[PDB]
Amino acid sequence: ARVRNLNRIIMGKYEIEPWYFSPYPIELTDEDFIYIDDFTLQYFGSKKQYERYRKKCTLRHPPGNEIYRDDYVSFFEIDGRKQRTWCRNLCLLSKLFLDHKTLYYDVDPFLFYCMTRRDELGHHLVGYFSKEKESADGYNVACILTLPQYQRMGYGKLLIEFSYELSKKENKVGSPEKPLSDLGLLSYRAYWSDTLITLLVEHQKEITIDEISSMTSMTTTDILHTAKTLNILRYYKGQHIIFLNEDILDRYNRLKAKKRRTIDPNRLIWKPP
Numbered sequence: 001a002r003v004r005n006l007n008r009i010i011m012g013k014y015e016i017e018p019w020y021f022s023p024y025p026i027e028l029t030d031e032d033f034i035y036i037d038d039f040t041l042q043y044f045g046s047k048k049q050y051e052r053y054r055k056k057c058t059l060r061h062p063p064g065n066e067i068y069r070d071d072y073v074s075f076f077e078i079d080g081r082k083q084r085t086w087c088r089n090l091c092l093l094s095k096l097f098l099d100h101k102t103l104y105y106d107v108d109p110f111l112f113y114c115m116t117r118r119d120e121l122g123h124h125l126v127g128y129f130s131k132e133k134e135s136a137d138g139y140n141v142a143c144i145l146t147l148p149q150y151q152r153m154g155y156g157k158l159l160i161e162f163s164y165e166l167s168k169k170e171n172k173v174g175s176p177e178k179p180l181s182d183l184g185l186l187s188y189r190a191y192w193s194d195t196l197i198t199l200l201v202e203h204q205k206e207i208t209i210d211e212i213s214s215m216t217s218m219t220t221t222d223i224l225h226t227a228k229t230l231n232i233l234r235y236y237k238g239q240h241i242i243f244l245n246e247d248i249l250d251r252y253n254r255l256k257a258k259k260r261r262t263i264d265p266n267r268l269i270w271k272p273p
């Protein structure tokens with residue numbers, strides 16, 4: 001009698017192996033897989049069951065308001081309390097790739113911003129970031145995730161950039177919840193670096209900390225840490241600034257050479273509560 005662990009989830013054409021254990025309320029059997037509907041995120045122990053529900057009539061995108069939509073991606077804002085089932089399913093899926101995550105069942109305190117890539121086939125959920133409706137620490141991101149099958153394609157940086165656009169619209173600085181996984185912290189460091197580098201080349205050769213936080217919603221701490229790492233911190237005109245140098249120009253051009261997609265602030269149709 002085999003009592004197997006969840007060793008693989010079948011999502012669309014993808015067969016993904018979890019990185020960590022997730023509390024799916026499922027029976028342990030001699031099989032080690034479950035089906036995850038790529039639209040509803042519902043889990044099924046049998047292909048037949050999955051098929052049975054797949055036929056049902058359902059929307060083909062996350063259950064929320066589309067507050068951003070460009071030719072590349074869309075962002076749906078979902079209130080956990082309004083979509084408990086879907087969001088709980090999202091959290092269970094997310095935990096498979098997180099060392100730790102708050103109780104998956106309690107989604108009410110969160111707002112989920114889910115990003116989809118649109119193809120000739122429609123919407124495809126590629127990642128998301130949750131956010132406390134009320135954060136005592138001012139965290140502008142609780143958890144953030146790019147589904148495994150879509151990682152290392154630039155989606156993570158888009159998720160992060162979007163979280164800062166919300167903060168900017170809210171007229172507040174913000175920073176991701178600590179502690180961050182190594183993957184998460186390294187992604188933020190790259191984003192913060194790319195952001196200061198782009199500002200120095202496209203906005204001004206010299207910029208004060210205040211100006212930076214005002215334009216990016218990045219906190220003083222994340223700005224200083226990033227500036228020190230790049231060796232671009234100085235004192236000019238009576239205050240601390242970051243400055244441009246050949247290294248930064250070089251980095252900027254290399255960044256641009258990758259012709260990466262970015263978020264257009266003008267397409268965010270959203271008003272904070």
Ligand SMILES: CC(C)(COP(=O)(O)OP(=O)(O)OC[C@H]1O[C@@H](n2cnc3c(N)ncnc32)[C@H](O)[C@@H]1OP(=O)(O)O)[C@@H](O)C(=O)NCCC(=O)NCCS
Nearest residue numbers: 097144145146151152153154155156157180181183184187
């Ligand atoms: C952290 C996380 C969101 C990052 O998401 P991601 O989609 O992989 O992020 P990005 O793709 O924007 O990261 C940039 C990387 O992708 C690579 N990349 C992006 N587009 C690419 C392309 N078209 N071709 C080749 N490489 C590409 C970049 O070269 C870069 O590699 P590097 O970090 O070694 O320099 C993701 O690793 C994840 O969900 N991890 C598990 C959950 C987790 O730990 N979340 C954070 C909790 S604190």
